[PDB]
From a paper:
Hormone binding favors LBD head-to-head homodimerization, helix 12 (H12) binding over the hormone-binding pocket, and exposure of the activating function-2 (AF-2) cleft where transcriptional coregulators bind via LXXLL motifs. SERMs and SERDs are comprised of a heterocyclic core that mimics hormone binding and a side-arm that disfavors the H12 agonist conformation. Rather, H12 packs into the AF-2 cleft via an LXXML motif to sterically preclude transcriptional coregulator binding.
Hydrogen bonds are formed between the T6I core, E353, R394, and a water molecule while the side arm forms a hydrogen bond with D351 to favor an antagonistic H12 conformation that is docked into the AF2-cleft. It should be noted that we previously reduced alkyl length to an ethyl with T6I-13-1 and observed reduced efficacy compared to the propyl of T6I-14-1.
Numbering used by the authors:
A (entry chain A), B (entry chain A): 310 to 335, 343 to 415, 420 to 461, 465 to 526, 534 to 548
């Protein structure tokens, strides 16, 4: 694919924005939301170029390592234009007072604010989210396994090329392109941090459930 | 500073390689080693360009967030040329059988192997380690605080420029430069992951101890 075809494919693959299911006229809400998003996550992952080329075992491993980071970056992206609040759903917009939960809440807000300051574009966001899917499990995986890693690194490389294409397209200098690429990728370290803190706070989709959702028939 | 002056400064700032203190003729060893390295860590941090320009409070916060990542990347760097082992010290080279410890052990080995495959250069390593110091605490911090963040981001940007300079210097194409920059920075997400897993396994230098070591007289 060209760089522009990568962007188009990623933008069309975007999952829908789900609603919280509480009676409008009247933690479980957050858990219920995450349950429903996971199914659409699977469908999104299978449309990330190169992902379905992996073994089903490798797909499960990547989704198992990445799922909370992917939910968290989606949240931070939705919340960008809502200073001081997290848009868990269009009908569930909470501030820090409504949130060990407030510690994680404050980190998500700070990431949303950093996105705001950098003026993160939707095209960049979908590249970052695909990078999370491919990268988060790649250091925790046979000849076929060596081939699986090479492929993942080639796909990651093409997303890097795509991010740079977007920035050159927008008129950034070569220096500004590298600098913004680095700033975006360092935010992924903070998203990993939050995911780890969140996985600590949650003590989770099982391998078998993920495999059951990924191991589709035709 | 020029890019080449950044590299020289960072290389000279490198801390010494400490030895384990056990009687050669005959977890505490790992803890003792980390205690001694922390003091040299402080001295190293104060020589990272731009770090001492921060408030003492901001320096402490950054070191508090980064210290285990910095110890871990140093370990992975030392261990690169020792497949299957971790060189905690020149006299303490352990394999995974000698190591919830083995889970973290295996992640460090995998990072060392990834460094090996990419042929990480010492000049790149010192850039990455400085990036960890400046980035790991920056999303968890007043007008002076806004000025502190701008400065940190400017220093981070200059290290990005330096990494690219090193890669262009080595003859990489512009495409290969961006791709390698991205590959290096994504490894920092895995180092953060390991640090979080390690901080979980350790349940640590206090704020006051760090401040006491950083709040030097003349
Ligand atoms: C029944 C089985 N399932 C499969 C395993 C399990 C699901 O685990 C969950 C539960 C809740 C969440 C929500 C949630 C929801 C939607 C969203 O888009 C993002 C998030 C983000 C997020 C901080 C991470 N969160 C929290 O509640 C939170 C906590 C403390 C501070 C702030 C926020 C995420 C995952 C239940
Ligand atoms: C007395 C007060 N101090 C201040 C707080 C506290 C210090 O905490 C420590 C203790 C130990 C370590 C060592 C250590 C040492 C040197 C090195 O260069 C790197 C590391 C890396 C590392 C995995 C992270 N580690 C482990 O033991 C390990 C565990 C499980 C699997 C593999 C390795 C790091 C930090 C004690």
């Amino acid at each position: 694919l060209t760089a522009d075809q990568m962007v188009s494919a990623l933008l069309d693959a975007e999952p829908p924005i789900l609603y919280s299911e509480y009676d409008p006229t009247r933690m479980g809400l957050l858990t219920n939301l995450a349950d429903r998003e996971l199914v659409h996550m699977i469908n999104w992952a299978k449309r990330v170029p190169g992902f379905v080329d992996l073994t089903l075992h490798d797909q499960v491993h990547l989704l198992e390592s990445a799922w909370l980071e992917i939910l968290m970056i989606g949240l931070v992206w939705r919340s960008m234009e809502h200073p001081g609040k997290l848009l868990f759903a269009p009908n569930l917009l909470l501030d820090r007072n409504q949130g060990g939960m407030v510690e994680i809440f404050d980190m998500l807000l700070a990431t949303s604010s950093r996105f705001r300051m950098m003026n993160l574009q939707g095209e960049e966001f979908v590249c970052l989210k695909s990078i999370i899917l491919l990268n988060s499990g790649v250091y925790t995986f046979t000849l076929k396994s060596l081939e699986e890693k090479d492929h993942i690194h080639r796909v990651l490389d093409k997303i890097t090329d795509t991010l740079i294409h977007l920035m050159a397209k927008a008129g950034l200098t070569l220096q500004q392109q590298h600098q913004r690429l680095a700033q975006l990728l360092l935010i992924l370290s903070h998203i990993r941090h939050m995911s780890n803190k969140g996985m600590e706070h949650l003590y989770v989709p099982s391998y078998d459930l993920l495999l059951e959702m990924l191991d589709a028939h035709r």
